[PDB]
Paper text:
Gene transcription is a fundamental cellular process carried out by the multi-subunit RNA polymerase (RNAP), which is conserved from bacteria to humans (Cramer, 2002, Werner, 2008). The σ54, which controls stress related genes including those involved in nitrogen fixation, nutrient starvation, infection, and other cellular stresses, forms a class of its own (Buck et al., 2000, Merrick, 1993). σ54 recruits RNAP to its promoter sites via binding to the −12 and −24 consensus promoter sequences and forms a stable RPc that rarely spontaneously isomerizes to RPo. Instead, it requires ATPase activators bound remotely upstream of RPc to convert to RPo (Buck et al., 2000). In order to understand how transcription is initiated and how initial de novo synthesis is carried out, we prepared samples to capture the RPo and the RPitc state by binding σ54 R336A to a promoter (−35 to +28) with a pre-opened transcription bubble (mismatch between −10 and −1 by mutating the non-template [NT] strand) to form RPo and then adding UpG di-nucleotide as well as GTP, to allow de novo synthesis of a −1 UpGGG +3 RNA to form RPitc.
Our cryoelectron microscopy (cryo-EM) reconstruction of RPo at 3.4 Å shows that most of the RNAP has clear density for side chains. DNA is visible with a clear trace for the T and NT strands. The DNA strands are first separated from around −11 with the NT strand draping over the σ54 ELH toward the β subunit. Interestingly, the ELH appears longer compared to that in RPip with density for residues up to 324 although is still short of the fully extended ELH. The transcription bubble contains 13 nt (−11 to +2) of single-stranded DNA (ssDNA) with dsDNA downstream of +3. The NT strand follows a path that is lined with positively charged residues, whereas the T strand goes through a tunnel formed by β (residues 538–543), β′ coiled-coil loop (residues 318–323) and σ54 RII.3 (residues 107–112). The downstream ss-dsDNA junction is very similar to those observed in σ70 RPo with +2 NT base inserted into a hydrophobic pocket formed by β subunit and +1 NT base forms hydrophobic-base interactions with W183 of β subunit (Zhang et al., 2012). It is noteworthy that, despite the structural and functional differences between σ54 and σ70, the transcription bubble architecture remains the same, opening at −11 at the upstream edge while returning to dsDNA at +3. However the DNA path as well as the ways the transcription bubble are stabilized at the upstream edge are different, with σ70 using conserved Trp residues to stabilize the flipped out −11 NT base, while σ54 uses its ELH to physically separate the two strands (Bae et al., 2015, Feklistov and Darst, 2011, Zhang et al., 2012). Upon loading deep into the RNAP channel as observed in RPo and RPitc, the RNAP clamp closes down, returning to a conformation similar to that of RPc.
Numbering used by the authors:
A (entry chain M): 106 to 257, 259 to 292, 320 to 396, 398 to 413, 415 to 473
B (entry chain C): 1 to 1341
C (entry chain D): 52 to 101
D (entry chain D): 253 to 553
The structure:
Amino acid sequence: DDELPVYQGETTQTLQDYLMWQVELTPFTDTDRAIATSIVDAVDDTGYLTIQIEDIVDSIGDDEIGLEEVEAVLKRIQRFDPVGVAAKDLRDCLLIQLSQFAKETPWLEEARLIISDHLDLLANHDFRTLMRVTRLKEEVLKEAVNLIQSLDXXXXXXXXXXXXXXXXXXXXXXXXXXXXXXXXXXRSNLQEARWLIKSLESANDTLLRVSRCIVEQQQAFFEQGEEYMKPMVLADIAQAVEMHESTISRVTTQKYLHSPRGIXXXXXXXXXXXXXXXXASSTAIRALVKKLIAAENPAKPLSDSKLTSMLSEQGIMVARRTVAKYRESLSIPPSNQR
Amino acid sequence: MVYSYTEKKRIRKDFGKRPQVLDVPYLLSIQLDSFQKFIEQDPEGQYGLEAAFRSVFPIQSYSGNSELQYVSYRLGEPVFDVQECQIRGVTYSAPLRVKLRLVIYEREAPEGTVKDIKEQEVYMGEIPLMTDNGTFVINGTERVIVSQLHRSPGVFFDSDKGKTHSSGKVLYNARIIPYRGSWLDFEFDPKDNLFVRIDRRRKLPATIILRALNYTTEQILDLFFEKVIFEIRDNKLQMELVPERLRGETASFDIEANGKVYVEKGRRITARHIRQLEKDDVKLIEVPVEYIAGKVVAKDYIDESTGELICAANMELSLDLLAKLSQSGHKRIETLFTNDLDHGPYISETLRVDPTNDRLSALVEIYRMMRPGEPPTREAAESLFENLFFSEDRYDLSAVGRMKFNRSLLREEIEGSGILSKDDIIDVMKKLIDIRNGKGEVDDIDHLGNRRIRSVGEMAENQFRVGLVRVERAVKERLSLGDLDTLMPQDMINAKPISAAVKEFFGSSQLSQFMDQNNPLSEITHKRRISALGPGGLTRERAGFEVRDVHPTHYGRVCPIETPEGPNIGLINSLSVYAQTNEYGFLETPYRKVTDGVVTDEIHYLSAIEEGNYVIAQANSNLDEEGHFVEDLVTCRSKGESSLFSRDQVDYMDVSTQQVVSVGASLIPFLEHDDANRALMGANMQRQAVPTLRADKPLVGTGMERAVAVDSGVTAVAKRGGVVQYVDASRIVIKVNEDEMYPGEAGIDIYNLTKYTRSNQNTCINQMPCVSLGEPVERGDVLADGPSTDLGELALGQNMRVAFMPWNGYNFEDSILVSERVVQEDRFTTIHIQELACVSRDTKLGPEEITADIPNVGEAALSKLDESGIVYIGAEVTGGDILVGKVTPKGETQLTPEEKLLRAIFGEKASDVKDSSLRVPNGVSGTVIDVQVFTRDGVEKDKRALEIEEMQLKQAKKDLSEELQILEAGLFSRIRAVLVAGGVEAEKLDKLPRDRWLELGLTDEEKQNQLEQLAEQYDELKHEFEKKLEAKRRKITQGDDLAPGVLKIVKVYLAVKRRIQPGDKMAGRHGNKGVISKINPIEDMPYDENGTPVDIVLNPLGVPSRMNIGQILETHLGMAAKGIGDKINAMLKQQQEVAKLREFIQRAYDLGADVRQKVDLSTFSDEEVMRLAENLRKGMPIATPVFDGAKEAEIKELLKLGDLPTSGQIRLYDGRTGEQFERPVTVGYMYMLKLNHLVDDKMHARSTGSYSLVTQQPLGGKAQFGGQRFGEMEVWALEAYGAAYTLQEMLTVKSDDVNGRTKMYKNIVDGNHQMEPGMPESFNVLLKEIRSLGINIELED
Amino acid sequence: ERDGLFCARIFGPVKDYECLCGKYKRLKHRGVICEKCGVEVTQTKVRRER
Amino acid sequence: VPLDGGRFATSDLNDLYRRVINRNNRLKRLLDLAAPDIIVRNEKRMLQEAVDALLDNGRRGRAITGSNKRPLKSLADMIKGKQGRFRQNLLGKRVDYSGRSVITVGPYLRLHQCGLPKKMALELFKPFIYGKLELRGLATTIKAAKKMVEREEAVVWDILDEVIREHPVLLNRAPTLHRLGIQAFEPVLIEGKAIQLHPLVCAAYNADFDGDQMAVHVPLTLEAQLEARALMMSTNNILSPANGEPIIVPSQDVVLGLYYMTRDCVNAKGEGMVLTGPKEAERLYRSGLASLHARVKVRIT
């Protein structure tokens, strides 16, 4: 309705909204505005990625309209407010961000064009042999690299994500004797509707009792003090109150339990039974696998088979494949550096 | 009277002729005494918690034989102080604990009890306590709770003023009003029949409600009417005579009394023929038969043989009946009287309309009547009947209801049960009919006799009782087949309903509001306020214009001047000065007692009902040393009136002239000369003033300022006083006299002043010490001044040399031109502190950390931050400089060459984190005065979070160390004293500290006694003091109670000085307001022959039309006030002797007729006089109380002593042209204020901003950048001009046309200025919303 | 939720030319519909019309 | 209506749709179940209650909810705030390029003008400024312009003057009672936070200077500017289109000064001189004479 501040909206501006605003105000032709609108949607909240170019060209359905037309227009779009916008590959991002250094920057212009244009793939590790490639030495190259490292990446300045999306918790786990104890914190027609409320008010009091109950059984199923969490099956919680698996997983999926470590509520009931006599499921396998891979490789061992042998020494019956596959995942440099 | 101490630093001069008797009271007192009576142990049981415990306990369960009871309450001590609690943001309260005895008994065994057990205490809720000053701190906010004035319980009557039926009548309706429960309202019909309404129900017959009382129709009519008699035996037909019962009638036949005619047919009915038959003894006489035909039978009459059928009741007798009753042999016949002059035949027509007079039919009729549909179950009837009134607790009118119910019906006993009864309602109907009969009048609802005040005691007790009953309906279920776990007063009580109800009240409630913290006098006047609104009544817009008006009983109870001028007008009132309140909740006001024609100094508080009976004199009247009135005819008040009476008639007198006026207005000089409405503004404007850097004492004033200041509790006042040991800006200690002290505590008193602190209105609170050092202080003297206080006076504005005269149109209308001097000298410069908070919390994606370092952010921006990331204390911050930085991680960035490449090049720069930080709001400014940083336990905060830890720890250690230095000095004095008797080493004993290792054994007596006492007391004080430091230390290192979804907390304070500009909104006490039009250079102002320019120039043309002449008299006396200080200035500046200075000040103080202030010098000597004179160098502060104030004559007299012209006008010169103005001009000191309206807060301006999702229009207001409602009248005005393009771009392009706003702005940027109007969103919406009903609306081409 | 208030399909998409079911993500097509759902792309101002 | 911590809460109008859907599904379920006429009867009743409650929460009694209740709102109530289309549409759009400040007096500043606070324009005129900046060539791109007016240095104030020149603004106050209550003026930039309004128009506006506040609006286009010059400028309408008699009439200290200038007085030096032109300024300014008097005989064309 009106005359009050109903949550009508804010109409904030994202990056694509703002870029399109910036396109509205620039001297594009009828067609070039179609290519521009075609590119600004391709852009991402991350900036740099304008995804595939030749799909931008082919998306228009031929009829002339070469590659060069989208290329020029593309450059000009890449030139709008947040300096380096879009482009591709980060290389051209840093070349567009480097396009304006005012040209009055000492030593930076040339060196920066050489480093940023080409050979930047080898600049990851360190200088080393690159120092011999560009003939530079001492701090001449190091100061240019200070500028290159001073650039930042793409957009993510427009952002428009003021919403942190907090957790709000649901049930509090007051820590007891090296464990956890639940408390669960935080005329006649409508009169007959009043009655439904009595039932809703009676169920509202038991809503906390379900959280404290399932929470108590969840604390009894997995040891808190132990590394990760003891392996459990939904059949235990389904054994206690005799509730269906999907229902319990739904309650733990919706609500989020706050313990002293982890905010992480439905992950405390999901585990494997390992299917082995000698033995914390995949939690400690992948967790402690990445932990053992954290301190290792004095220089560049890059050996996942040695880590698989170390896992087999612990009595987990490693397959040298599964263990290495789960260990090398999630950004793990293992086996990649070989 | 030698005054006291700080008072002798500046004495105002008093012009008030009338002596004072009763001292002005505590002012605030009305808050304290309420809540002080709500927290008490009472033996009688009422008055506070005890009453809510006894309102339920003991509980009976369901046929349980076991029960539960409770014994007192007690309390805990509050965990935090008021300042701590205010900082931390925690609500300030204390634990409520109660010992409940449990009695468990055996089943089937009568009176037998198997066991009893009770918990030490059960802890239920925390009740918020009250500060000393009248506020409840709640989540670190002050919040004053407002008193409410509500229609009182008891019996009420109303004429309706016959404004309904259009014929006109008197329709007398009576409503009964309980404290809690249903309402019964008896009314009259246009056809003259009584009706019963229950809780605003459609009318019912009258005799059903009475029929519920087990009264038969015979008992109904016999009980509610006359008895009389009639007798016919063998056609003798002798009826009883009732001459006194009738004032008139028409006689159809000759009436013979004992063989002689008393009144012939058609003879005079006048009192001659009445007393003629009165003085003569006359028995029953015979009358004509035709007269009986109009009479109606009362009691049911049946024949001896047959009792069948006819004539039960309420039937006009017929000639057929005479034969039957005459043949039956009944000698006596009792019939109703019903002769209509005063009396009337009511209640009988109600029986005519009553469908059935049976009890059960009435109970079923009302039972089925309450709820619209209902089956005739018969149980609903028995339930609702006993329930809706006679239940123990269901309907309770309580003590005001019972008392006023007794005095309403004129019952002698003032005590009774809180539930109604048969005879109660019967008597109410009796009085109601009596009002119709002409005997008796109605009650005025506006009368203060009928309107009671409730304060925070009584209301907290209400909600606490509510909350407790909602517990008891639950705890009743533990013994309900909940069986036995024992351990009952632990698990059985749930504290959650009690606590949520109490903190629900104080939190959120119409009558708990944030306190007005700008001004002391704003504080005060908030905390004595009586509102008609809220929970208990007066929904407003529907109230009507009669509760607005001043009624004659508000005389010295509320105030007729102080009231909001806004559309709640007369609704929100303010207590008058000397007003108080009874135990029953009624306003009573003091009076001096006059016996014979001498005025005794005994005072009596009279209530509004008590007051009207008597005669009361006038506040300002004459009098003699003996105490007799000078004038023989004295103007007095009686009842609703006023007029002159004789000397011997009046028994009372008004105490002081301040009685009518409220404290707000009691401050305004010359309030007589002001019109009341204009007085009415200015009283309101002194609230919304704003305290400035240096506080100037008002130079002319009422005398009231000392009370307000020191009562308001914004000043620091010295308890138990003595000489000042140590002084400083933040701290002031008093070494108390040896006289007042608690033995064994010894020690001194410390006072920590509060430095710069946001107020609820984002203004400074600052205390600055008045006292010097090495100065004696008595109890009650002010050590510091709060803001807008000078040496214990209330100083809300500044004095300004004013000139009345138009000046080039710059002061036009109500505007106001000011010398640049004023702006240079920084009066009117006011501080403003603003809070901003940063909180760092746990998300789904993991925890958030604060600072060092951030993605995508320059070193430039980060230069003002710390190692920890909070800004250095002291930084100047503007615009979107980063006050605290903070990082929020995003989801799972893994692989592919570009991601690994950015992570390799830049080191990922913490990768998924974002930029989320505490940047300053755009368009705000100021230095960072303080940072708090509350953390979490076990977060391992380190960094700079520890600086406040060490800081507060050093402050606490330094504050405690003083008592150890003084007590250790005393113990060292005893040890140093005992060593003199024997083995005295003199200096060698002083140069060897630490007991000189006991100085061996000395004598055995000194060995055991001196070593035991010295070592014992030494180790106990050392270990105890170190223990206090360890407990406090454990209190320092910890983290607060806090939400599960928050990790660590930081708050930053900013301060800005704001400088007056031409948006000032300056005012004066007299309802004077304006803006600042211009700031002139100094040479451009008008100046006098000595070259002193006026500060501020104001427009004479204000003053006649508005008729506020306080202004003018203020100026003149102000002029004369400066004059004396100029004499003294010039005198001390010439290094005159003390004697002559003494002579001129003494000669100044003593001027005027009467004036009752006798201060004279020679009592205080040498300095003390030099002191004050230097204290009054800047002007002499003359003080004119409200209606006894200074006369013109005294002002000219005072003014001639200053060699100023008597007329108060002076030649002034133009500043530009140098030319004399023709005609003299009034110049004078008037005392100005700066109001809380500043344009910095006002000027907005937007071009294109954010819109609304639906309707797509710009947002509401500034801060959010509204654009500016262009409303229906504004369109009408354009249409009227016929300018349709301007109107068309308003409607569309610049609000809801989305494509057209874009095209518009793009063409503007390009210089096209063309519209391309489209169709506004909001129309489209409407078309969907009408399509949402089954109506199509489509636009047809 | 599918077939509910608020729902995709009827009432249109949620992101501009990006739609649920993660396919034909942008501007490849003026209209189109997924195989998982009836999502019809074309812009998302359509929550204000449909 | 999204919340503080996330986890969106349902709006007022949604509840009505949820309710109707629940009763529709339950009546359908019991209808396809082939059950007694009593219970499906009560379901027919309940659903008419539900749809009638979603179209108007009035019609009968209670409606509302257990939410703190209040009638809620319905699609009937949903009609434009005041249940007229007052709000939102119909003369009532809230609006753009607008601002508002306190009024002071204008005591130089001729009738057709209006002291507009320097800081406050610069906002109102933003689009206009960027145009000029791009013309002069001080900004090649919109972001450049944008940045220089954000930095608000130097050329920009110089261009502001050039933007404002002859561009009529329009001011409006409070209750607008008659058409005079909004009028149009040539602004003159003035450092300050407040708007200076010429005295003579204070009549019309019914405004004193005790803290009244004015809105300001910017006509764009051309048509609108001309309608402001040739209709709403304060110099078009000096006469009140009710009674017809002039507004603009001098009040308050203007009156007092004319009335003082023209008086007669007895004596008051330099009486009965004969002079021509007069001009007579000579003589008042020089002393020589008293303007209240002399009953000087002067020659006049």
